[PDB]
Symmetry: C4
Subunit: 355 residues, 4 copies
């Protein structure tokens, strides 16, 4: 609620071409299709092939920043990015070579930061998941068997066996309801009366396991990235020890591109920022262009008013961001700091239009 | 659990007529319907047309409070509120002009406060959503393909292609179970064994993303609206800095209309209020009518007893509200304040019936 | 994880007979059933009729504790508990009079404490629910219409109208998948690609609204009931102000019946209790029977050992309960208290077997 | 996100053979199967029979550590682990004796630690579950009846009775959508419009009940196991009282096996450990092999750098683990401790390669 994400979070074209790339597939998958566009896109594969392959060698020029690096992950596909289609072309002479379009799907994952964030936590908590995964299979076969108990008499064709009903368990437990084969008797239908009750109790926990500290990690991800930009601020030599733990959970940093807006004038004032790298366009008669290591919004928050400037991203800025309460908090935290923000709430009244 | 919402939260008639308005639609959508009521409601469209259109120009009299305002949102439909039906009437001579009853649906959203609250946060957290949205599409096509691997042999008619099975993925992953086309073999059925497991793991996070800080924002929404009504209280010059952060998370403010009840006598005492604007009817022999800047309930809470007055909304009041624990908290917070609430717990014993 | 619920939480027989009572229904609902047991249970209705009716008048003797009471809720059915069957017997001469077995279903709700806990909170938070409830209907008809756009050509029989497809929305949005009528075209199937995504995003919030402060209320329910049993403890004149807020969130109180066990000897020590009303059976050579206002377990927790006594519920006791960490917390909170628990950790070593 | 689970959390072979054991079942469940492998696996039952039975008596040698033990749970199946097949062999002469492969399913649960963790909490919170369980059945039959109201006219075959529609309730309420029997009329279809809305509101709470303090218990499970390894650290005589409550929620301990890696050199430094039992391989010219009661990572965290050693599990170690923020926290908590970690951040610079 308090952050300005701009400049193309979905930036790298390496990520991009997988999307139109794999949509090339389906038209090869279909009868009675003209050969015209059929092969038009095999070229587009060759483009994306050639595109990464053009990109490839410069990546294989991995002498840039060659001091200490661990790039087996990022490279792991780039190798396969171009090899698999090639051997696919020859050994798999039939058109199915395209079905090694199973490949590029990792390329988004090549630079899907927020994906390692996933894998980081499974190696702490899957202790639970396994015993649950058992406990799932506990309740599967314990319950799945109870079907074979019954309708083997009059539904051999459907429930003439164990796994045929195990099939009817997970669909039945995992919230689905396909609608293929359902009992005809009383008690065999009774037994379902605890099942959805169960699995919604199960996944109520089991899925709960994921969001559990996933949130913690992302709540943690916003500190690990932001114990940086702390000493960069000229003022933070006085901040007491535990003050910062109270704060940095909320402070998120994002980048803005050049040319963009930061806050428009007259819109309702709701937030204030700390600038630490880049520069701005403080839209005033004398533009008070504050570069790395500044802030703005105190003019709007102490007064509870609209914006006093159409601040715009003159350059690419590294931002923080902050709403009132936690600034009210910090204003509550110390009279030391509100003084200068009292003074600044007068300085930037005259300094905004003046030099 | 601690708040009195009265006076028509769903107030504005602009919001209201969309509901009966669009129910006018269906009777135009049906064969063998008499023309009688068929056109009876085309008038009702003209009413609602004329109604907003009556409302319209006074809104276009936007010279009221014309100092600094940003009303492109609120106006964005009012324009289209009446234009689209008009051109619809002529160019679309056929009855389908009514099918530009797609229009009024924003009119509730015109004044759906709590809807901007939605949009505020997506622009902080969708960083996650996108990489998840990929990760969804990751697991879609990676898995969706695995179907075409198999039953192309004996189900061309159903799984003779890729997207025909991608269809069977999302229904299969997104908890649904339509029941159109399901495999017949072993391993192709095996592969589902991780799928619902997956998607319930996915949306366990992905939907989790929404409630994540949506709660934070609404937990924040109750502070931003309520750092107001703080200095309005005559007593709060002494309250220490961090005291208020501890409190205002819970304190919600809502309005009551004139004529209504506030707390009935004899019902079990569970809460106390702070009055800051309006007036009451303290139901006693001498009504102790306390207007802006007062409170009541300490008589009931320190003693743990029923109500000592049928307090009623003599006027439209701006209320706070509070349960014991957090007043017990504040009574724990300082002996300074419990003194006057000790005294008040004697003053309003004699002052309730006396003058 | 830290509480001993015994003595029949599902106690009152008023609650009980609704269950077998309404199971009497179905056998009246069925052809080709013998009249034998058919009317056997109409008596059982008359029993339960007569049973509450026997109970009834003593309830209508509401002169017990007649000082200040608000019993319109509890009585609201007791009236109808016996009247509705009666007029049902005569005006509805046909067997359908039994279909006013719609009635007793409130009788569990008559004394379903934890049900008012539900209703308490909806009157704080439904502010959200309504705008969501709109937002649901927003996305319903906005999206539902998009079906009528399309398959009216070749599925009049199924999608020849608006609401016929609105039907296919909620089933489609609300996680269900009935399996009646599904499209045949491409784009009309495409549009589903955001739908389950949506509704699982919706109810990810909307259901989230319920557990949101429901938890808060039950987390609150355990304080409101337990600021009691605080001053009852002889030791708690020294406990500082904010100490208790830290604690009482976890401390749950429940009753045990006479004759039952409290903690068995030799089982692993994991918890300690505070006795405040009732008495025990401290299973030792000289039973150290401590009545109201005592505790035990410090012998097991400071040492990290099994139980030193088969404490058993000699009488009906009002208990608290507590695990280590929060006692370790309190042992961390002050050296004042650990002294007496150090001394008690020696006194009850010799006092356990001695007098 | 901060823990190294190694050495076979799914260790005991008692747990293992249940999995292949019960997969032996299905081939006995099927017609037209050769007798060859049919009886090949009846042996495998005899193996697993003989295997536990081999294991059995040594367990019945329960004189190991015979001072105070409560092993009725662990033994409860071991008895039945071998008896049930035996009587099954004779009384059930027909092949169905194998259908007492319902038995081993508890054997994983015999040593499914994290399963008692489940059962611990249901005996605190099911107070809610019951009243909900009623409230479920409240809304079941109240609503289920509403179907019999209607389509008894034209669907006797499907809705000619009460429970036939109660069936259509839970499937309808519990998120499923089987697809057997659905109405044909307007209002009977209308009534569903609140149902999925309801049950997703219900299980939004009811499943919520589970994760509610399940999380608390596992958040508690990580303290109860870890108030240990506290005094084992030589340094923690100075740590203030409430310091530890702030910490131990996150500190998880897990074991590593001998031969394994602990942290590889050059990988990005993100965490630090406290060694309290075992020993390491500090990969340096002079290996600084620190055994019980040590730590490492401060070299990487204060500087924000890669690893300074390929530390590897020379032996089986009992570990803690910790990320920066909470070490930054502790570094914020006191200048007393950062001194020695300042000194250690110089000592292990020269001591790493030297002796
Ligand atoms: K479903
Ligand atoms: K279905």
């Amino acid at each position: 609620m308090s952050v300005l994400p701009f400049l193309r979070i979905y930036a790298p074209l390496n990520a991009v071409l997988a999307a139109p790339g794999l949509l090339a597939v389906a038209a090869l998958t279909i009868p009675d299709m003209s050969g015209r566009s059929r092969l038009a896109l095999a070229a587009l594969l060759a483009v994306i092939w050639g595109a990464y392959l053009l990109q490839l060698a410069a990546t294989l020029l991995k002498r840039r920043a060659g001091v200490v690096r661990d790039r087996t992950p990022k490279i792991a596909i780039d190798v396969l990015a171009v090899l698999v289609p090639l051997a696919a072309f020859l050994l798999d002479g039939s058109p199915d070579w395209s079905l090694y379009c199973a490949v590029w799907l990792l390329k988004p994952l090549r630079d899907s930061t927020f994906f390692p964030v996933l894998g980081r936590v499974l190696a702490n908590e899957a202790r639970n998941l396994i015993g649950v995964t058992t406990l799932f299979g506990v309740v599967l076969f314990a319950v799945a068997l109870a079907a074979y108990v019954i309708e083997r008499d009059i539904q051999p064709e459907k429930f003439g066996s164990i796994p045929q009903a195990m099939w009817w368990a997970v669909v039945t437990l995992s919230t689905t309801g396909y609608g293929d084969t359902i009992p005809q008797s009383f008690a065999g239908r009774v037994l379902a009366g605890a099942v959805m009750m169960s699995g919604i109790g199960i996944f109520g926990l089991w899925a709960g396991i994921l969001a559990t500290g996933f949130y913690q990690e992302v709540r943690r991800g916003d500190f690990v990235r932001n114990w940086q930009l702390v000493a960069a601020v000229p003022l933070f030599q006085k901040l007491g020890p535990a003050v910062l733990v109270e704060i940095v959970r909320a402070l998120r940093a994002r980048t803005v591109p050049a040319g963009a807006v930061i806050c428009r004038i007259g819109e309702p004032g709701d937030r204030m920022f700390f600038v630490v790298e880049g520069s701005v366009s403080v839209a005033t008669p004398n533009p008070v262009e504050l570069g790395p290591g500044a802030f703005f919004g105190e003019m709007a928050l102490i007064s509870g008013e609209p914006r006093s400037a159409t601040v715009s991203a003159a350059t690419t800025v590294s931002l923080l961001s902050l709403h009132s309460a936690d600034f009210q908090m910090l204003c509550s935290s110390s009279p030391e700091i509100a003084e200068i923000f009292r003074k600044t709430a007068l300085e930037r009244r005259g300094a905004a239009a003046s030099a």
